[PDB]
Design a protein around this ligand. Structure first.
Ligand SMILES: Nc1ncccc1OCc1ccccc1
Length: 351
């Protein structure tokens, strides 16, 4: 039942993994955590294996670990990263200390691929279609990604795309500061914390990505939070009184009102030469009032995607119980929860 493990040291650390995984080779330069590429001899799949660092060192870290495992176990969709395997060399709860996770090896992300360059309209159609397809799935389970950007989108030779690296740990203030890609795709309401946010923040990110694929340029490359807000408001216009009401921070509401009023620009003269159907879709995504943005399910039926739309093949997710987020537990309790999820894991059918 229990497989045989073997040990080796790599650039760093003792890795201890089932024999099925061969040819471990350090990847990412540690940008993704401690990650090795490998070949899984049981599936024939090229895989990424992550060893979690100090998963249970604190309450906050124990919960993070549990959170990532729960989320990865839930997701089963062509356009979303899933879990191939999860293991520990530990034989009991008492000795449980390390957690390893296994997924498809991704090669190129959309960032380091389309760096500084425009795509053809049919490629924009197909890439945005798949993002919205994965997002309909994610949103139907009441999961919000929260951090969509080109670097979290993986694409292979045949233009096939998966969404990766969900928002699982809140960013520091410093990484959100200045002229940084980490902030350029973020909805204004969450960038300035105007109000309680919801899944519609992801649709704002999609519009920012779509614009960039059409022009080859960052849509809102702000030098800081406030510079970025000015770039946004110049395009979509300053808030009307209806939206101002919904901003529950008095200080933010007050700052917005200090600004000279501006009308929404003509998108056809911004995105010169673009498919009129693409322009129409951009206007429906890039709307300041989040209540009024188009949803993923609605966008999928938009005429821009007539080439790819298939209502019988755009599935939704099983319900996802997130009650644990409200829950306050000891380190050892989070750890015991995690062990149960490791132990109960069943791999996906190879078909
Ligand atoms: N899939 C990957 N491809 C290349 C480098 C890193 C990758 O993912 C790291 C990972 C593995 C397991 C769970 C979560 C993240």
């Amino acid at each position: 039942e229990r497989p045989t493990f073997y040990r080796q040291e790599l650039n760093k650390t003792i890795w201890e993994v089932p024999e099925r995984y061969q040819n471990l080779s350090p990847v990412g330069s540690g940008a993704y955590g401690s990650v090795c590429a490998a070949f899984d001899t049981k599936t024939g799949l090229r895989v990424a294996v992550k060893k979690l660092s100090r998963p249970f060192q604190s309450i906050i870290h124990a919960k993070r670990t549990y959170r990532e495992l729960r989320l990865l176990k839930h997701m089963k969709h062509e356009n979303v990263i899933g879990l191939l395997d999860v293991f520990t060399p530990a034989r009991s709860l008492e000795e449980f200390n390390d957690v390893y996770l296994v997924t498809h090896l991704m090669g190129a992300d959309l960032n380091n691929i389309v760096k500084c360059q425009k795509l053809t309209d049919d490629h924009v159609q197909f890439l945005i279609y798949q993002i919205l397809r994965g997002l309909k799935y994610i949103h139907s389970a009441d999961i919000i990604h929260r951090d969509l950007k080109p670097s979290n989108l993986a694409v292979n030779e045949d233009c096939e795309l998966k969404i990766l690296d969900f928002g699982l740990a809140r960013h520091t203030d410093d990484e959100m500061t200045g002229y940084v890609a980490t902030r350029w795709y973020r909805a204004p309401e969450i960038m300035l914390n105007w109000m309680h946010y919801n899944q519609t923040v992801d649709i704002w990110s999609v519009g920012c990505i779509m614009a960039e694929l059409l022009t080859g340029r960052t849509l809102f490359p702000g030098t800081d939070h406030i510079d970025q807000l000015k770039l946004i408001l110049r395009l979509v216009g300053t808030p009307g009184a209806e939206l101002l009401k919904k901003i529950s921070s008095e200080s933010a509401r007050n700052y917005i009102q200090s600004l000279t009023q501006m009308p929404k620009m003509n998108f056809a003269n911004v995105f010169i030469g673009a498919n009129p159907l693409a322009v129409d879709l951009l206007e429906k995504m890039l709307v300041l009032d989040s209540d009024k943005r188009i949803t993923a399910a609605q966008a999928l039926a938009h005429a821009y995607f007539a080439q790819y739309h298939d209502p019988d093949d755009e599935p939704v997710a099983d319900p996802y119980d997130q009650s644990f987020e409200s829950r306050d537990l000891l380190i050892d309790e989070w750890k015991s929860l995690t062990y149960d999820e490791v132990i109960s894991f069943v791999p996906p059918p190879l078909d």
